Structures are given as structure tokens and as C-alpha cells.
Design a protein around this nucleic acid. Structure first.
Lengths: 555, 411
DNA sequence: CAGTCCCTGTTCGGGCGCCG
DNA sequence: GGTCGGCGCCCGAACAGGGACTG
């Protein structure tokens, strides 16, 4: 067997474990013909070699159809091998995005063929890549081969190819520094500001460099004219857009269908502004079977119809200009949903996106806005390596009030206010000093762990009092209920004294939404008030009326 | 031609496998130039995917510095080699360093590049340089010499370092010299003038062996933040409730605290804004509690076998308080920072500055870095903290969310 | 007292999308 | 078909830790 011009990556097994020894699956006669035709062809080219009985290893093998071609692809079920092979550190840290490309004079795209089959495998590792090819007769012993190149299906093949490919391109990139080469597996976006004459020269120069190592650049995949098809996109000299997206039009929707639906809507939200998947993802909660038909809700059918109406119109993105600033603007779409657009010139979006996570049981719009800014910042640093300036639908004074009084550290990068309703604001402010002339409510609540019963009420300085029996509750729900009662039966200004750290920690965070209906009712009463002062006192210390109301709600 | 000191991980533990976070453009260009230079001087060499280990890497600029500095987050590797730099080749900590009038820090990390690393251990110093928009796959390297920021580097170089410092330690015996990570702490009771001169004498004493920095500290002027009670002449119901709550919380630290006579003033169901006169038995319980807060806590002392822990509380208006302890309510040291860089505009910058100041103090006093309990959300911290870091070490931290209880550490 | 117990947050594992 | 790796999303479950109360 000849020596491959590329250096080979030394691969070991995990210490203590032997090679795979698994029996072959029964294969259909149409797949056996496709395998023997490709096996006999790869053994002529030095990519697989015959092995005898001295090789005690074996692994299954099969073949699937290639997309839009009569050719077949050979795949090996290395699931038992991959378990015992050594761990690899992948060198693919993410996916390039067209919004990060810079305008270049000339652009060329090429794709080498049979990429993994042009890179050798380690010599001392070829023994564990043994597999059997079942013949047309079940009694025929079958032909056993072992791989000489990177087997499609092994966990080290992509890692090894990406690193081997970068090593071959370094001498070219070292001699041609002004040439931009986007390397993603077997695909090379090549672009330069050189004139179109010396461009094609450097392309051919690359096509020969690569050829010296057994990497073929077929003219079938060569692309010299715009638009270019790269990474699911359509690259034009001034704009870009995603490859057409097709949503299913199922009359009866299954879970698996929504999952494919949600997945393509998320992919479309990168340049299609305003895609919402809130009500469609609400169909995937608490469901157990991809084989479970699910009816569309009224809010989900509306959300789908809106998204279909956005995909009808054509949208496009632009490229990155390092000379001008980066700008990102956020809007408040729906409750728990946010959208943004990143651009450098107005209405010429580099890309769009959405953020909708709900973090926590209790939160407000200011928290979610801060989470969205951070998601945009990280995403921006990935693609452009800088933080955009931000246009936020929150008043400067609103944000200054929040971060200065919040107990956690919080910060937003350089930003400016944009008046685009709905505006993010704080719905209520707890006073810092007790209110003069306001009735003072000493609240408490307790429950029994066993009976699940409890009381909650209050005692005031004006003689007012209330106690309410509660069924199927906890100690925390009662302490919250006691505060809800004091809010109900008080005027516009009220001082409230509790001994519940749990209740006080929730309200001081100024939430405007919650997963608990009792909290939402407390919030609604807090918005109606003009002045509210909350205070905490230690329990069981004989403090004020807090000990008098602790004894009323004791049982 | 130097012999390599054999190093091994702690038994039953693999190397670090931490993903590289995204880096800005100005950082990646700085790492490329440095790494290309360090490769040309043979300090590092390119590797491949067969190495399953990786450690994050980013760059910094020290205080009032224009040049970038390569920094590796070897916190995970240092945890997995802890038995080496503590048992076999430990460094003693001078208890007199914290008593000097002036202490100066010197980056001596460039000297570690003169000593080769053990061949079998180079596999764990692996790191990856990312690219903008993921143009190219990860450019991986590994160290061929003693890496900066690894705890095993100052322990191996310790024998070489002592021989360089002996001619200077002999001429200046009253000067205390401590070595932590890539820094060298030199403290002296001399006047500020001749102190800086002796630093330059050392600086040239290290330049002749094949090695520059300047950051002055004054540990004798380090103060602590006690628990203080308000000195009001007219007390309202609300004031007395806040006072009892604070005294109740402080009773976990000073067992002698009593709130019996003050709680008696909170018998009736009174309005919060109503003024209450202090009884005679209460005015004495308040003055006695003020004297107990003047006394030091009983039974508090540093344990070298225990990990330090630090908590930070945002007090607003650029105020930040902190406490260092090993066992709860046994605070070895409390304090408060104010008017740091980024006050009244940025909270992550202030929190980053406070951690650095606290860690620096922990190195001078105990020679250890505490594990921080940071008052911030993880994602907020992990997004911005690298943009304000100006130090060659990185402490450990965790994220807490404790709502303010009753302002115990700040009035 | 150490043990639950009530609550809240995090981590992970399992789907789909996209790319090669 | 039921191969690999990368990234993104969305959900549930499983795990973790911190309180408060009670045997």
C-alpha cells in the first residue's frame, strides 16, 4: 500500500478496551450490489484492503442513498468502536455567518470531492476498522476489509479532517496573506480585493497546491459567477439571503411535525424579522409521543398564519462594513418574547433574531431585556468580534432607577433610548421610608405540614384585623396570602410588616409577571397603590403586632 | 539542556476539558501575534485533535499598560495538580509581608519560559485560539516551557529563583520577598523614595539573569469595616424594628447581643412612624451592644488547611462591602470599597475591581486566593468580566442571589 | 438536633432545525 | 435511512442548595 502525501493523525483506543466484535446486519440485495461495487472500487484505489482471519474485529456496515444522484454512500455503524476510541477535541467552534463577511472584489467557492477519502487513517489504527460485506447468499462467508482512509461515521473523522485541512492551507495562506479563505470542512470560500485577472490565477494556484496532497477540486463544484451557494445561503455582490425555506402544510399535525416546524421557524428568524414560536412551542409541553397527533390552538393557528405571511415577502441581509458602527435594536413583541435587528444603516439588516426564554418563576421586563442584550452581545462577538451599540425601548431614567437600587450587579453596554412602544418600565416602586399617616399592617401566615391547612391575616394600628382559613397550602403560600390580604383591605398608602424572607425577596425584585397566580394578584394590587412600604422583622421575638398576628394564624 | 522536573496529576483525575469562550477582535489579534512569536522562540508548538484536553485563553492589559498579555485560565488544571505545589514543593508564606509599610508587585512570568516542561505533562497545557465568525477552525497549541499562570511553574522555578534572590536578600535582609503565581511581592519598611530605588536595584538584579512591573500596596493602611449602630436621638417604631432585626442578625457573630429590653418597646401594635421614647433598661442594652461590636469575635483564627471564602454585598452609591471567612460567622476580615473605577455607571467593572483588590489582600495576608460568592447572575458576569480583568491570576467563584435582609454591613 | 419539606435554579439529555 | 462532528432552539426530568419547621 502506497504512502499518502498527508501526515497521519495518531489515534489510540481508551486504555483497557479492545476493538469491536459485532456481527453484520442482514442487508437487502439492492444494497449489497451497491456496496460490493463501491468496495471493489475503493480497494483498487488503495482505500480499503483485504484482511484475513488474523483480524478478530468486525463492525456492521450499510449504505444510504445520495441526495439527487444515483450514487450510494458507504456508512459504517461504529457505535461500538466510537465508545472505545479515544476522546477528540473538536476544532469546529461554531458556524460562520454571512453577516460577518466583508465586501470583496472577487469571490470563488469550491468543494473538494470525496474529502474524507483523500485523508489517510493512522496505520496502527486501521485494524479496528474491520467490517464484513454480506454476499447475495447467506451461506457465502463474505468479504472482510479494513479502512485506509477516514471512515464516514467514525467520531474522529471530522476532527481529523478539519485539522489536516488547515495544515495544508497554512503554506498558501502564509504566502497569500490578503486572500480570505473561509474553511468549513470541505468547503472553501475564497475572496480577495485583487483584480479579477490575478484572482483566477491565485485560485488555480490553490487548486494545484491542494492537488499536491491528493485533494481534488472538480470543476463541477467550481463556482465563479454570483450568486454563490454557501452554507445554506445565496451570496450576491451586495446582499445575501437564506436558501428557500419550505414549511409543511399538514392538515393533521403531529408532534414530530411541530418540531420540524419550530426548527425551520427558528432558522428563518435570522433574517426574517418578527417570527414568533411562542404559541407553537406551547404545543410541545407535557407531550410524550412524536406519534401523537395534536390539534392546533386558536393562538397557534394565528401565530402560524402570521409567520407564513412573513415568509411570502422576500428579505435579504447585507454584509459587514468595519468602517461604520454596529447597531442593535430590540422590541417587545409578546409577553416573554423579544426580537432584535442588527444593522449599520437604517433598514439594511445584517441579521435579525429573537429571544424568548423564561428564566425564573418571577421576573419583569427589565430583567428579560438585560438577558436579551447579553444574548445579542455574545452572538455579536462571535460573528463580528465587537459589541453593537444598542437602541432600547426603555427610558434612561427607568434603567437608572433599576440598576442603582437592585442588589445584584447589573449593567448594559453603551446604549440610547428609542421611543418605540411598548416601552419597558417598572410598574411599581417600593418606598424606602415608612409612610406617615398610612395604616400599618402586621401580617403573618402559617400552615401545618400534615393537615395542609393554615391561616393568614393581619393586625393594624387602627384596630383593623382579619384572619382567613386556608386549605391545601404551605407555609410560604400563607405568608404571601397575608400580604395579599393587607393590600386588598388597605388604602392607597399602606405600611406592611412581615417576617417572611421568602415573600420579601420576591416583591423587592419588582416583578411584573409570575408563574404563581397569587404573586400576579399581589402584583396587580401593588400597581393600584400609590405608596407601599415593606419591612421585615424577626419572628418569635415579641415584635409589635407581628407576635399578636403570629398567635392568631398559629394553627 | 536543562533537566525536566517530572509532574503528575492527582490520582484518579483526567486533564482539563474546558471549551474556549468567544473572544473580541482586539484580543484575537493580540494572541495571534504573541503565539506566533512564542512559537518562533520554541516556547509553544502546534498540536492536533488527538489531544482531548483544552484550556480557555484570553488577553488582558494590566493597570496603566499598553501592551497586551496572554492569560490562560488554568484554574481547572491547577485543581487537578494540587498535590504537587502544596506537598512536595510548597512555598512558605511570610507572616511579616502584611506588616510592611509598602509592598510592590513584580510580574516575573517571563522567567518561566527559560525552563522546559516535562514531556509527559505538555499534553495538559493545551489551548485553542478561536477565529472571528469561525472563519477557520481552532488553532491549537501546547506549551514547551513552564506556562504562565500554572501553579506548578513557581514551584519548579523556586529552586532557581532562590539562587537569584540570595545575593539581593543578603545585602537587604530586612526586605521580605514572596512569590505567588507569576508575581513577586517585595515589602519593606523603608521610605517611599528609597523603597522604589531598591525595587529598581532588584529589577536590574533580575535583568542580568534573563528576565518588569510596578504596583504599590500599603498593607499597614488596610482597615476593617465593623458593624455599627445608628446614633439617633429620636427613635421611631420602624427605627427600633430595624435595630432589633440587625441586632438579632449580629447575635450569630457576637453571642453576647441582647434584644430583650428593646423588643419590650415593640409590645403594642403601633404605627411605624410613631416616635417611641427609649426606656432606661433599653438605653443600657443599646450601649452595651455598641461595646460588644467594638470587641473582636472570640475564637476566630486562620486555619491553613481550610479554603478561604469571600462574600460581596452591593450597598449602592458606589459602596461595596466584603467579608473573608473559612467557617460561617467567623470572619477573618471585613471591609468596604468605595469610589472604584466605574462607580455610578458600571457594576460589573466595580465588582471586577473589588474581586481583584480582595484577592490581592488574601495573597498578602494568607498566601491564598479565596473562592468568591459573587452577587451577580452568571450570565451577566460571564459576558463582561474579561473586559475589566487586569491581573495575572484568576480566583474561583460562584453566583448567589441573596435579597438584602437588614443592612448588616453598611449603615 | 438531623431530618424532611417547600421553593427555586441549574444541568443535562432528548427531540427538531441548519451545515459539511 | 436510523453514521459522525459542530452550532442553535425548546421541554422535561434529574440534580442541587438554601431556607424554615418538626420529630
Amino acid at each position: 500500500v502506497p504512502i499518502s502525501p498527508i501526515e497521519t493523525v495518531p489515534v489510540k483506543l481508551k486504555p483497557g478496551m479492545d476493538g469491536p466484535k459485532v456481527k453484520q446486519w442482514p442487508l437487502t440485495e439492492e444494497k449489497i450490489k451497491a456496496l460490493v461495487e463501491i468496495c471493489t472500487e475503493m480497494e483498487k484505489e488503495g482505500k480499503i484492503s483485504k484482511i484475513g482471519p488474523e483480524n478478530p474485529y468486525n463492525t456492521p456496515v450499510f449504505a444510504i442513498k445520495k441526495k439527487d444522484s444515483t450514487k450510494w454512500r458507504k456508512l459504517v455503524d461504529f457505535r461500538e468502536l466510537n465508545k472505545r476510541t479515544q476522546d477528540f477535541w473538536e476544532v469546529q467552534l461554531g458556524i460562520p455567518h454571512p453577516a460577518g463577511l466583508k465586501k470583496k472584489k472577487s469571490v470563488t467557492v469550491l468543494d473538494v470531492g470525496d474529502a474524507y477519502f483523500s485523508v489517510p487513517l493512522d496505520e496502527d489504527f486501521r485494524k479496528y476498522t474491520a467490517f464484513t460485506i454480506p454476499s447475495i447468499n447467506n451461506e457465502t462467508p463474505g468479504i472482510r476489509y479494513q479502512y485506509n482512509v477516514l471512515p464516514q461515521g467514525w467520531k474522529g473523522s471530522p476532527a481529523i479532517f478539519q485539522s489536516s485541512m488547515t495544515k495544508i492551507l497554512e503554506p498558501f495562506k502564509k504566502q497569500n496573506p490578503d486572500i480570505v479563505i473561509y474553511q468549513y470542512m470541505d468547503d472553501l470560500y475564497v475572496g480577495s480585493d485583487l483584480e479579477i485577472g490575478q484572482h483566477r490565477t491565485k485560485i488555480e494556484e490553490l487548486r494545484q497546491h491542494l492537488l499536491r496532497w491528493g485533494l481534488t477540486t472538480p470543476d463541477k463544484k467550481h463556482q465563479k459567477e454570483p450568486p454563490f451557494l454557501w452554507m445554506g445561503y445565496e451570496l450576491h455582490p451586495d446582499k445575501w439571503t437564506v436558501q428557500p425555506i419550505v414549511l409543511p402544510e399538514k392538515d393533521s399535525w403531529t408532534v414530530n411535525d411541530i418540531c420540524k416546524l419550530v426548527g425551520k421557524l427558528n432558522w428563518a428568524s435570522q433574517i426574517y424579522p418578527g417570527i414568533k414560536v411562542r404559541q407553537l412551542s406551547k404545543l410541545l409541553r407535557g407531550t410524550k409521543a412524536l406519534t401523537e397527533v395534536i390539534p392546533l390552538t386558536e393562538e397557534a393557528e394565528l401565530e402560524l398564519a402570521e409567520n407564513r405571511e412573513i415568509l411570502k415577502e422576500p428579505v435579504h441581509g447585507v454584509y459587514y462594513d468595519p468602517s461604520k458602527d454596529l447597531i442593535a435594536e430590540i422590541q417587545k413583541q409578546g409577553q416573554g418574547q423579544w426580537t432584535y435587528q442588527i444593522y449599520q444603516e437604517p433598514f439594511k439588516n445584517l441579521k435579525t433574531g429573537k429571544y424568548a426564554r423564561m428564566r425564573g418563576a418571577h421576573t419583569n421586563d427589565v430583567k428579560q431585556l438585560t438577558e436579551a442584550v447579553q444574548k445579542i452581545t455574545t452572538e455579536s462577538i462571535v460573528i463580528w468580534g465587537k459589541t453593537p451599540k444598542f437602541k432600547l425601548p426603555i427610558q434612561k431614567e427607568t434603567w437608572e432607577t433599576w440598576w442603582t437600587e437592585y442588589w445584584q450587579a447589573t449593567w448594559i453596554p453603551e446604549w440610547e433610548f428609542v421611543n418605540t412602544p411598548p416601552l419597558v418600565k417598572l410598574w411599581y416602586q417600593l418606598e424606602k421610608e415608612p409612610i406617615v399617616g398610612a395604616e400599618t399592617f402586621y401580617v403573618d401566615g402559617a400552615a401545618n405540614r400534615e393537615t395542609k391547612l393554615g391561616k393568614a391575616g393581619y393586625v393594624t394600628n387602627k384596630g383593623r384585623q382579619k384572619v382567613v382559613p386556608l386549605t391545601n397550602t404551605t407555609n410560604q403560600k400563607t405568608e404571601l396570602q397575608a400580604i395579599y390580604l393587607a393590600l386588598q383591605d388597605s388604602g392607597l398608602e399602606v405600611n406592611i410588616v412581615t417576617n417572611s424572607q421568602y415573600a420579601l425577596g420576591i416583591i423587592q425584585a419588582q416583578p411584573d409577571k409570575s408563574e404563581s397566580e397569587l404573586v400576579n394578584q399581589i402584583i396587580e394590587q401593588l400597581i393600584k397603590k400609590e405608596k407601599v412600604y415593606l419591612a421585615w422583622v424577626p419572628a418569635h421575638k415579641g415584635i409589635g403586632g407581628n407576635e399578636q398576628v403570629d398567635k392568631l394564624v398559629s394553627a | 539542556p536543562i533537566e525536566t522536573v517530572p509532574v503528575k496529576l492527582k490520582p484518579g483525575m483526567d486533564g482539563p476539558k474546558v471549551k474556549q469562550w468567544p473572544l473580541t477582535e482586539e484580543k484575537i489579534k493580540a494572541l495571534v501575534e504573541i503565539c506566533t512569536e512564542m512559537e518562533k522562540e520554541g516556547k509553544i508548538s502546534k498540536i492536533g485533535p488527538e489531544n482531548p484536553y483544552n484550556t480557555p485563553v484570553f488577553a488582558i492589559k494590566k493597570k496603566d499598560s499598553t501592551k497586551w498579555r496572554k492569560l490562560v485560565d488554568f484554574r481547572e488544571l491547577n485543581k487537578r495538580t494540587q498535590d504537587f505545589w502544596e506537598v512536595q514543593l510548597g512555598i512558605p508564606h511570610p507572616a511579616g509581608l502584611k506588616k510592611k509599610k509598602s509592598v510592590t508587585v513584580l510580574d516575573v512570568g517571563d522567567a518561566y519560559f527559560s525552563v522546559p516542561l516535562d514531556e509527559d505533562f505538555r499534553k495538559y497545557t493545551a489551548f485553542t485560539i478561536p477565529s472571528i465568525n469561525n472563519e477557520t477552525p481552532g488553532i491549537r497549541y501546547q506549551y514547551n516551557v513552564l506556562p504562565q499562570g500554572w501553579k506548578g511553574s513557581p514551584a519548579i522555578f523556586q529552586s532557581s529563583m532562590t539562587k537569584i534572590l540570595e545575593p539581593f536578600k543578603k545585602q537587604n535582609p530586612d526586605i521580605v520577598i514572596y512569590q505567588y503565581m507569576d508575581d513577586l511581592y517585595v515589602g519593606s519598611d523603608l521610605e517611599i523614595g528609597q523603597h522604589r530605588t531598591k525595587i529598581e536595584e532588584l529589577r536590574q538584579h533580575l535583568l542580568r539573569w534573563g528576565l518588569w512591573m510596578g504596583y504599590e500596596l500599603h498593607p499597614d493602611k488596610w482597615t476593617v469595616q465593623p458593624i455599627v449602630l445608628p446614633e439617633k436621638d429620636s427613635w421611631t417604631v420602624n427605627d427600633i424594628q430595624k435595630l432589633v432585626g440587625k441586632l438579632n442578625w449580629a447575635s450569630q457573630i457576637y453571642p453576647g447581643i441582647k434584644v430583650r429590653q428593646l423588643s419590650k418597646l415593640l409590645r403594642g401594635t403601633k404605627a411605624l412612624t410613631e416616635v417611641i421614647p427609649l426606656t432606661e433598661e433599653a438605653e443600657l442594652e443599646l450601649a452595651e451592644n455598641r461595646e460588644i461590636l467594638k470587641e473582636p469575635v472570640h475564637g476566630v483564627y486562620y486555619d491553613p488547611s481550610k479554603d478561604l471564602i469571600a462574600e460581596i454585598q452591593k450597598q449602592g452609591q458606589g459602596q461595596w462591602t466584603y467579608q473573608i471567612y473559612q467557617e460561617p460567622f467567623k470572619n477573618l476580615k471585613t471591609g468596604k470599597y468605595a469610589r472604584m473605577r466605574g462607580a455610578h455607571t458600571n457594576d460589573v467593572k466595580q465588582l471586577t475591581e473589588a474581586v481583584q483588590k480582595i484577592t490581592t489582600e488574601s495573597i498578602v495576608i494568607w498566601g491564598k486566593t479565596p473562592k468568591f460568592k459573587l452577587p451577580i447572575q452568571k450570565e451577566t458576569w460571564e459576558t463582561w468580566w474579561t473586559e475589566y480583568w487586569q491581573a495575572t491570576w484568576i480566583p474561583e467563584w460562584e453566583f448567589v442571589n441573596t435579597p438584602p435582609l437588614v443592612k448588616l454591613w453598611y449603615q
